[PDB]
Write an enzyme that holds these catalytic residues in place. Structure first.
Site, PDB file in Angstrom:
ATOM      1  N   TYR A   1      43.868 -11.149  63.757  1.00  0.00           N
ATOM      2  CA  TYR A   1      43.997 -11.694  65.097  1.00  0.00           C
ATOM      3  C   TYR A   1      43.321 -10.819  66.146  1.00  0.00           C
ATOM      4  O   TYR A   1      43.392 -11.136  67.338  1.00  0.00           O
ATOM      5  CB  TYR A   1      45.481 -11.904  65.455  1.00  0.00           C
ATOM      6  CG  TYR A   1      46.455 -10.816  65.022  1.00  0.00           C
ATOM      7  CD1 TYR A   1      46.727  -9.739  65.856  1.00  0.00           C
ATOM      8  CD2 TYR A   1      47.128 -10.887  63.807  1.00  0.00           C
ATOM      9  CE1 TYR A   1      47.626  -8.755  65.485  1.00  0.00           C
ATOM     10  CE2 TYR A   1      48.030  -9.904  63.426  1.00  0.00           C
ATOM     11  CZ  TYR A   1      48.274  -8.843  64.272  1.00  0.00           C
ATOM     12  OH  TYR A   1      49.167  -7.858  63.919  1.00  0.00           O
TER      13      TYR A   1
ATOM     14  N   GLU B   1      52.666   3.255  64.520  1.00  0.00           N
ATOM     15  CA  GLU B   1      52.391   4.644  64.169  1.00  0.00           C
ATOM     16  C   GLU B   1      51.037   4.718  63.461  1.00  0.00           C
ATOM     17  O   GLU B   1      50.654   3.806  62.725  1.00  0.00           O
ATOM     18  CB  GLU B   1      53.487   5.207  63.257  1.00  0.00           C
ATOM     19  CG  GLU B   1      53.309   6.683  62.955  1.00  0.00           C
ATOM     20  CD  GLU B   1      54.037   7.122  61.698  1.00  0.00           C
ATOM     21  OE1 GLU B   1      54.578   6.251  60.983  1.00  0.00           O
ATOM     22  OE2 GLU B   1      54.039   8.339  61.409  1.00  0.00           O
TER      23      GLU B   1
ATOM     24  N   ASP C   1      47.672   8.187  58.065  1.00  0.00           N
ATOM     25  CA  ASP C   1      46.429   8.912  57.819  1.00  0.00           C
ATOM     26  C   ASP C   1      45.443   8.086  56.999  1.00  0.00           C
ATOM     27  O   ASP C   1      44.228   8.171  57.219  1.00  0.00           O
ATOM     28  CB  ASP C   1      46.727  10.252  57.137  1.00  0.00           C
ATOM     29  CG  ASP C   1      47.746  11.090  57.909  1.00  0.00           C
ATOM     30  OD1 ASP C   1      48.159  10.673  59.013  1.00  0.00           O
ATOM     31  OD2 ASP C   1      48.135  12.164  57.403  1.00  0.00           O
TER      32      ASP C   1
ATOM     33  N   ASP D   1      44.712   4.380  54.161  1.00  0.00           N
ATOM     34  CA  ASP D   1      45.114   3.146  53.498  1.00  0.00           C
ATOM     35  C   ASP D   1      44.735   3.278  52.026  1.00  0.00           C
ATOM     36  O   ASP D   1      43.746   3.932  51.687  1.00  0.00           O
ATOM     37  CB  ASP D   1      44.480   1.885  54.118  1.00  0.00           C
ATOM     38  CG  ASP D   1      42.965   1.832  53.973  1.00  0.00           C
ATOM     39  OD1 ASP D   1      42.244   2.629  54.605  1.00  0.00           O
ATOM     40  OD2 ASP D   1      42.492   0.958  53.215  1.00  0.00           O
TER      41      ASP D   1
ATOM     42  N   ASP E   1      51.385 -11.025  50.927  1.00  0.00           N
ATOM     43  CA  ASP E   1      50.030 -10.500  50.956  1.00  0.00           C
ATOM     44  C   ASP E   1      50.024  -9.027  50.553  1.00  0.00           C
ATOM     45  O   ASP E   1      49.589  -8.144  51.285  1.00  0.00           O
ATOM     46  CB  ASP E   1      49.415 -10.674  52.343  1.00  0.00           C
ATOM     47  CG  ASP E   1      47.903 -10.464  52.341  1.00  0.00           C
ATOM     48  OD1 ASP E   1      47.313 -10.396  51.243  1.00  0.00           O
ATOM     49  OD2 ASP E   1      47.308 -10.359  53.437  1.00  0.00           O
TER      50      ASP E   1
HETATM   51  C1  RVQ Z   1      47.997  -1.039  62.413  1.00  0.00           C
HETATM   52  C2  RVQ Z   1      48.898  -0.336  61.376  1.00  0.00           C
HETATM   53  C3  RVQ Z   1      49.222  -1.354  60.289  1.00  0.00           C
HETATM   54  N1  RVQ Z   1      48.252   0.891  60.964  1.00  0.00           N
HETATM   55  C4  RVQ Z   1      48.777   1.987  61.338  1.00  0.00           C
HETATM   56  N2  RVQ Z   1      48.004   2.949  60.848  1.00  0.00           N
HETATM   57  C5  RVQ Z   1      46.973   2.333  60.170  1.00  0.00           C
HETATM   58  C6  RVQ Z   1      45.866   2.719  59.455  1.00  0.00           C
HETATM   59  N3  RVQ Z   1      45.502   4.091  59.212  1.00  0.00           N
HETATM   60  C7  RVQ Z   1      44.646   4.477  57.997  1.00  0.00           C
HETATM   61  C8  RVQ Z   1      43.221   4.731  58.531  1.00  0.00           C
HETATM   62  N4  RVQ Z   1      42.850   5.750  59.244  1.00  0.00           N
HETATM   63  C9  RVQ Z   1      41.481   5.538  59.529  1.00  0.00           C
HETATM   64  C10 RVQ Z   1      40.514   6.263  60.247  1.00  0.00           C
HETATM   65  C11 RVQ Z   1      39.218   5.749  60.326  1.00  0.00           C
HETATM   66 CL1  RVQ Z   1      37.905   6.575  61.205  1.00  0.00          CL
HETATM   67  C12 RVQ Z   1      38.907   4.549  59.706  1.00  0.00           C
HETATM   68 CL2  RVQ Z   1      37.209   3.992  59.877  1.00  0.00          CL
HETATM   69  C13 RVQ Z   1      39.850   3.824  58.994  1.00  0.00           C
HETATM   70  C14 RVQ Z   1      41.110   4.321  58.915  1.00  0.00           C
HETATM   71  N5  RVQ Z   1      42.211   4.014  58.410  1.00  0.00           N
HETATM   72  N6  RVQ Z   1      45.083   1.796  58.951  1.00  0.00           N
HETATM   73  C15 RVQ Z   1      45.375   0.509  59.114  1.00  0.00           C
HETATM   74  N7  RVQ Z   1      44.497  -0.433  58.529  1.00  0.00           N
HETATM   75  C16 RVQ Z   1      43.408   0.176  57.805  1.00  0.00           C
HETATM   76  C17 RVQ Z   1      42.667  -0.901  57.034  1.00  0.00           C
HETATM   77  O1  RVQ Z   1      42.183  -1.854  57.940  1.00  0.00           O
HETATM   78  C18 RVQ Z   1      43.140  -2.451  58.782  1.00  0.00           C
HETATM   79  C19 RVQ Z   1      43.983  -1.401  59.482  1.00  0.00           C
HETATM   80  N8  RVQ Z   1      46.436   0.034  59.769  1.00  0.00           N
HETATM   81  C20 RVQ Z   1      47.183   0.953  60.297  1.00  0.00           C
END
Ligand code: RVQ
Lengths: 327, 248, 826
Positions: free
Chosen positions: A24, A100, A103, A105, A145
């Site tokens: 979204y 939050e 670090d 995924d 999911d």
């Molecule tokens: C919004 C909530 C659910 N949330 C809270 N912390 C995170 C989070 N953090 C891991 C992360 N740190 C990153 C830094 C960089 Cl530079 C990059 Cl490029 C990627 C990154 N990923 N990732 C995600 N997802 C990662 C995969 O795509 C969708 C978002 N969601 C999050």
């Protein structure tokens, strides 16, 4: 007060950058100006206004303000763009869902090849994942999911479940018509490949069993592009769906349609013979074809593999960040 | 953490609408008309009873923060139902809500929607969400009426009569500010209590504690009869003011 | 979409393996040398090697073994590629016509399995009954060598020992038997099993397990006179035969890890051992005979022979001649003498085979001012470290500048007529409390020298303990003359300070040209460095002066000059520093959204960032504002080894998986979300590990040749020595060369019958994709080597497009002109 959401402005966060393309909106990393905490900002764009505020985001707000768990991602507040003064009809500004910052995924860590899991690391992971899934299931919510990319992991070893954009309440007494295609093909259970439409919380268990297998090989178990090819791969490993093992398979829309090449025998224990016994038993029970014979989340937490794992000893996975520069 | 969504009766004398010159009778009339508009529109669309109630609760809460003189009530109602449908997973397209609202509203009433009905409604969603403070999960007296009635054992027919009569009292209470005064658990007990008096039934005998005369206390802790009787008085006032009588 | 072309300018030079046998004829002695994707076949003479044949394979050669099954006159060759492509090969010669026969082939990959830590292991039974493969933890794969198994079908035997170090087929056994060292929580052990093709399972093996050294590394199958195994460790060598245990622990081998072994005497009496400091040992098996008629092993002895190159593989040929196959330095032929020379050595070098070694960094500079480029590389490791100067003139001319320490980074400074080179050398904690170098090297043989006296971390208060015998790296900046390649100066950095990045440039309004180095304070305790420096040096009048130092809170992995400002990546941060009139660095802007900003490249006000795991990001300097802004990020997760900017829109990256890709701005500007998305439009498996991308070419520009179909020139250096080149194509030229590939792949016969489309497929453990946007120029350039019938078979029904004529038929000679122009880009 802390509870008056939707009013505080996103000015209160220094945006660090974009960390992902969402469903979204775009997802941003940011720092709170007042506290210094790092947050993740999920942007909701209602500027399209085809159907207004996306239901996907509504699900995440409705559910994640109810769920409180150490392994379920926490929504802190919802903030807004500077609103147009005295002109609410023109106001097209967006909303941001504050989370939050975690670090990593799991996908990015696995896709980059930068993680190694010991058995004791897999125990710490799965105990959190299943405890979080059990919290959700006791509250009658289905995630729908569960993929590696929706499991966030920060360096302390803590796991948190993340994208509830498809979560819906499950009623055992009242069977409800649900959406046929919910989980990514790789983590989709066989019951939904045949179009159940009235599925049980066991769909989430299947996905996590797929993750359990993947953590022992570092490669997903069922990689296919089409729904038929997926059923074939599951069948090569788990055995072909047939009334012998899934009495109600004959009730499913596509059982006669989507036959696999053969009526395969189950080889899960053979092709995974390199897995510890306590864990292999968990995988076999989680990757059971018949959702009514597939174990529950709780049953996994009362297994030889996860039962006696202690959360104080988290053992963070081996994410090496030195000697990566020069091999 | 979570907001407080309940007020004292005395506090309704200081709603924004009142302080802009609306009289108590008129604001309640507007509230009944708006709630019933939501109920009728959603019923025509085949919506689940929870979806209707959620919209009605959004509506009632909204006008504790805004005046009816600045927010036309049927537009607000349509918007609440529209959002309620998404919240409760019984979604409807805004155009279909407008279509039904036009079917049920006369020419003057549909004037509130202005030249572009869909836009007036969709635009309001932003204000609705900020007003309800994004606390979208709502519980309703229905689930408690059933949860508590399942623990009653006795004459199948006397209990079913109690439930149906109480259910009607819940539907009727949506037209009032009771939703803003008492938690749904208390509303479910009050309507059971009312049906009991009207049906000449002694509910304690159906409970696991048949010699506990204050039968509700094992369902809802800390509720005085003072409260349940205030709620009953407010529900029956609805019937006495109108031409309609108690269901029995 | 994007269209690009990739060619090899220098083939891989590092030796991945070497075997001997009777492959070309039952009579000749052959030496087969395996370089990445390349097989070289030699015949052993009394002076050296006679080359006879070289083939390429569409795969990295992982297993290479010669065997001779009953009924064959001569040895057959087994090869397994790193993508699990297996085949059995035969040499066949018809007069002047030499070809390689694919006798059996197939892909042995399992749908489910864990790749093992010690990598693919392949062994063959002494009776050539079967091939053993260790591909996955907990599994042993058997390809039985029956005549009918032309598809190399195989089965898996469950293996209880999940962590296997090494395995060999033993000699002298009633049934096929394996001896393997394995690791479990109780230490390491040696265990034996028998393999039953009839039962397709393991049976209990001939002899009992023994507990072995914790760092037991290699298993040697000792041949029939003394049958058994020899287990090589860090401190000890142990022989096991069932009831026999013999252990020698001579102090000489504790000093350096032994990494290769090979049999000298076919009776097993003598073995060769080599170590990581170049030492070559003789392992001698002392025999006692019993009147029973039986021979026994009496004792083991180890004798030092001399020095070779740090060698990955050893193979003894004949007489006194040994082939030393090195991956870190030049390979060699050396002769072992019975009598030592006056220095005490029994080893004397015969020939030296050039190995560009690991190319850690490189730059293109025109030393001769001949309008043609020269490539100066940082090549090799440890004592084999060197600078290599490569120029075109038909072969490549390569000069070697030995450094005897590891080169890390290189940059050219014209104002000073010299190069700056970062290097590191190994010293060992000695009894003085300090350290002592094992050999003199570039940083110690400089004309003038200096040592950093910085007080930045002087406060320390961090305790770091030292044990005698431990290694340390000492890092230096070398100033090296561009004509003599003499080490004019050497600057030693602080204790525990690593030099990671180096630039030569002017900053601001400052007319002086500086050498700038970015460093990291590396302590064993730290997961990621938390202290570092940016040091500004001036090379003037034979002396390096320290101009300014800037403390940073991390490792300065990458620096690059940016429009008179210094662009530096410190851990997750990307920073722009300004150079003040007081000759100090001052920060202007920061960008923090990274995991580890390993690599930086620039063009104009645009910056391409290579992340540890988050692929590549495109940043921009917004001068009106004085800050950075994000243009687009590649959201596909990849582990970067190097990056490069091709043009304002296309960006090149290299993966740790031996894969290349190209990202482009989406250039569909409807939505901001599209613009912030970098689309991977090119995917390609090179098969090499690219450390450095560098714009330039070695080709000459007198303008006799014409504007080639290719535009742009990026050179890249790899770990195996390959130098490759990436260039761009027009949509039209791509489609032609692509359509031609598909035609060539149907015509050209592959070794091992490996599908070309498979070889060049993008491949990670988790993903496999068909190649896109890349022309395998090495395939296109092979059109000129195929026979005339095949050439005309390729051009049948071939049509050009977007040309002067919209549809034009091709003739064989039409393509020869195009391909020959394409051969002139290198
Ligand atoms: C919004 C909530 C659910 N949330 C809270 N912390 C995170 C989070 N953090 C891991 C992360 N740190 C990153 C830094 C960089 Cl530079 C990059 Cl490029 C990627 C990154 N990923 N990732 C995600 N997802 C990662 C995969 O795509 C969708 C978002 N969601 C999050």
């Amino acid at each position: 007060t802390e509870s008056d959401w939707g009013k505080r402005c996103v000015d209160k966060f220094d945006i660090i950058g974009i960390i992902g393309e969402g469903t979204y909106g775009q997802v941003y990393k940011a720092k709170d100006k007042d506290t210094g905490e790092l947050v993740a900002l999920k942007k909701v764009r209602l500027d399209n206004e085809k159907e207004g505020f996306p239901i996907t985001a509504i699900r995440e707000i409705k559910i994640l303000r109810q769920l409180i768990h150490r392994s379920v991602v926490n929504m802190k507040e919802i903030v807004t763009d500077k609103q147009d003064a005295l002109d609410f009809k023109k106001d097209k500004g967006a909303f941001y869902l504050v989370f939050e910052y975690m670090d990593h995924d799991l996908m990015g860590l696995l896709e980059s090849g930068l993680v190694h899991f010991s058995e004791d690391h897999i125990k710490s992971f799965m105990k959190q994942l299943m405890e979080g899934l059990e919290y959700c299931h006791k509250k009658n919510f289905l995630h729908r999911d569960i993929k590696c990319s929706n499991i966030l992991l920060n360096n302390s070893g803590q796991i948190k479940l993340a994208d509830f954009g498809l979560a819906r309440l499950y009623n055992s007494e009242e069977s409800r018509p649900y959406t046929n295609k919910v989980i990514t093909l790789w983590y989709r259970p066989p019951e939904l490949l045949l179009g159940e439409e009235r599925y049980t919380p066991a769909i989430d268990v299947w996905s996590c069993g797929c993750i359990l297998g993947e953590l022992f090989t570092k490669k997903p178990i069922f990689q296919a592009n089409l729904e038929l090819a997926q059923l074939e791969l599951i069948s090569r490993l788990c055995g072909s769906p047939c009334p012998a093992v899934w009495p109600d398979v004959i009730r499913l829309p596509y059982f006669n349609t989507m036959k696999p090449k053969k009526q395969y025998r189950r080889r899960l224990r053979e092709e995974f013979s390199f897995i510890p016994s306590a864990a292999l038993d968990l995988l076999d029970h989680m990757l059971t074809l018949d959702p009514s014979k597939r174990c529950t989340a709780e049953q996994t937490l009362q297994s030889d593999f996860l039962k006696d794992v202690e959360l104080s000893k988290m053992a963070p996975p081996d994410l090496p960040h030195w000697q990566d520069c020069h091999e | 953490t979570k907001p407080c969504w309940y007020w004292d009766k005395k506090d309704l004398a200081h709603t924004p609408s009142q302080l802009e010159g609306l009289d108590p009778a008129t604001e309640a009339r507007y509230r009944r008309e708006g709630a019933r508009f939501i109920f009728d529109v959603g019923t025509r669309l085949g919506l689940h009873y929870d979806t209707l109630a959620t919209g009605i609760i959004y509506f009632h809460r909204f006008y504790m923060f805004h005046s009816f003189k600045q927010f036309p009530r049927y537009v607000t109602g349509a918007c609440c139902l529209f959002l309620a449908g998404k919240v409760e997973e019984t979604p409807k397209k805004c155009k279909d809500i407008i279509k039904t609202a036009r079917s049920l509203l006369n020419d003057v009433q549909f004037g509130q929607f202005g030249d572009d009905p869909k836009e007036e409604v969709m635009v309001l969603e932003r204000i609705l969400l900020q007003t309800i403070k994004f606390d979208l999960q709502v519980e309703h007296p229905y689930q408690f009426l059933l949860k508590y009635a399942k623990q009653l054992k006795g004459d199948k027919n006397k209990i079913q009569k109690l439930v149906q009569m109480a259910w009607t009292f819940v539907n009727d209470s949506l037209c009032t500010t009771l939703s803003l005064q008492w938690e749904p658990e208390i509303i479910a007990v009050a309507v059971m209590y009312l049906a009991g008096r009207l049906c000449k039934f002694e509910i304690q005998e159906w409970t696991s504690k048949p010699m506990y005369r204050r039968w509700w206390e094992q369902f809802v802790q800390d509720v005085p009869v003072d409260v349940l009787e205030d709620i009953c008085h407010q529900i029956l006032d609805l019937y006495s003011q109108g031409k309609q009588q108690m269901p029995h | 979409m994007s269209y690009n072309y990739v060619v090899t300018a220098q083939k891989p030079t590092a030796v991945n393996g070497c075997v001997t046998g009777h492959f070309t004829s039952a009579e000749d002695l052959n030496l087969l040398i395996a370089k990445n994707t390349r097989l070289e076949i030699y015949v052993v003479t009394a002076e050296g090697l006679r080359p006879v044949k070289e083939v390429g394979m569409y795969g990295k050669i992982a297993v290479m073994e010669l065997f001779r099954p009953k009924g064959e006159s001569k040895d057959l060759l087994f090869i397994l590629t790193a993508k699990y492509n297996a085949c059995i090969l035969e040499y066949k010669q018809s007069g002047e016509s030499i070809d390689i026969i694919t006798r059996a082939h197939g892909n042995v990959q399992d749908r489910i399995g864990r790749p093992s830590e010690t990598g693919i292991i392949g062994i063959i039974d002494p009776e050539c009954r079967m091939i053993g493969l260790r591909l996955y933890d907990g599994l042993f794969k058997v390809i039985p060598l029956d005549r009918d198994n032309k598809e190399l079908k195989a089965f898996n035997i469950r293996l209880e020992e999940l962590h296997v170090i090494d395995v060999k087929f033993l000699y002298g056994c009633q049934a096929p038997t394996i001896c393997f060292v394995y690791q479990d929580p109780q230490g390491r052990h040696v265990k034996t099993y028998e393999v039953s093709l009839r039962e397709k399972e393991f049976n209990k093996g001939p002899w009992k397990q023994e507990n072995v050294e914790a760092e037991a590394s290699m298993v040697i199958a000792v041949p029939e006179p003394f049958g058994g195994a020899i287990i090589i460790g860090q401190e000890s060598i142990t022989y096991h035969n069932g009831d026999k245990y013999l252990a020698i622990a001579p102090p000489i081998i504790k000093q350096s890890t032994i990494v290769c072994h090979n049999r000298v005497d076919p009776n097993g009496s003598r073995y060769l051992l080599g170590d990581m400091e170049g030492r070559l040992f003789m392992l001698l098996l002392e025999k006692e005979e019993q009147m029973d008629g039986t021979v026994t092993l009496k004792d083991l002895r180890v004798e030092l022979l001399g020095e070779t190159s740090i060698a990955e593989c050893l193979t003894y040929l004949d007489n006194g001649v040994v082939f030393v196959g090195s991956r870190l330095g030049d390979s060699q032929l050396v002769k072992l003498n019975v009598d030592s020379n006056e220095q005490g050595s029994y080893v004397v070098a015969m020939e030296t085979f050039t190995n560009l070694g690991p190319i850690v960094d490189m730059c293109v500079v025109d030393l001769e001012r001949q309008g043609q480029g020269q490539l100066v590389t940082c090549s090799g490791a440890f004592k084999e470290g060197s600078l290599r100067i490569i120029r075109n003139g038909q072969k490549l001319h390569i000069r070697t500048v030995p450094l005897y320490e590891s080169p890390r980074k290189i940059c050219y400074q014209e104002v000073s007529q010299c190069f700056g080179v970062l290097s590191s050398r190994i010293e060992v904690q000695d009894t003085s409390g300090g350290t002592t170098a094992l050999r003199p090297s570039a940083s110690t043989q400089a004309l003038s020298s200096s040592v950093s006296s910085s007080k930045l971390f002087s406060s320390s208060t961090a305790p770091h303990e030292t044990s005698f015998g431990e290694e340390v790296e000492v890092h230096n900046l070398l100033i090296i003359d561009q004509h003599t390649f003499e080490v004019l100066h050497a600057h030693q950095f602080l204790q525990n300070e690593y030099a990671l990045s180096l630039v030569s440039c002017k900053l601001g309004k400052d007319p002086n040209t500086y050498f700038i180095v970015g460093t990291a304070m590396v302590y064993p305790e730290e997961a990621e460095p938390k202290q570092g420096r940016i040091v500004v040096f001036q090379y003037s009048d034979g002396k390096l002066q320290t101009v300014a130092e800037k403390e940073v809170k991390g490792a300065v992995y990458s620096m690059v000059e940016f429009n008179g400002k210094l662009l530096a990546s410190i851990n997750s941060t990307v920073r722009l520093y300004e150079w003040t009139t007081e000759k100090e660095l001052r920060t202007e802007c920061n960008h923090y959204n990274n995991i580890m900003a390993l690599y930086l490249k620039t063009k104009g006000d645009f910056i391409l960032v290579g992340d540890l795991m988050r692929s590549v990001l495109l940043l921009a300097y917004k001068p009106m504002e004085g800050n950075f802004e994000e243009i687009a990020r590649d959201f596909n997760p990849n582990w970067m080894s190097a990056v490069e900017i091709l043009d304002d829109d296309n960006f090149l990256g290299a993966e740790n998986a031996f894969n290349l890709f190209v990202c482009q701005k989406d250039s569909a500007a409807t939505t901001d979300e599209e613009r912030q998305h970098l689309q991977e439009v090119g995917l390609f498996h090179l098969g090499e590990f690219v450390n450095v991308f560098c714009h330039g070419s070695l080709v000459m520009q007198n303008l006799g040749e014409t504007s080639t179909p290719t535009q742009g020139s990026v050179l890249f250096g790899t770990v195996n020595g390959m130098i490759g080149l990436v260039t761009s194509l027009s949509e039209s030229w791509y489609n032609l060369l692509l359509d031609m590939q598909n035609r060539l792949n149907k015509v050209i016969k592959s070794v091992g019958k490996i599908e070309h489309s498979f070889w060049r497929s993008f491949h990670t453990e988790r993903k496999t994709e068909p190649a896109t946007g890349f022309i395998d120029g090495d395939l296109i350039e092979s059109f000129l080597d195929i026979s005339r019938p095949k050439m005309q078979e390729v051009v049948a029904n071939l049509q050009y497009d977007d040309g002067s004529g919209m549809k034009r038929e091709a003739t064989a000679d039409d393509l020869i002109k195009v391909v020959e122009e394409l051969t002139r880009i290198h």
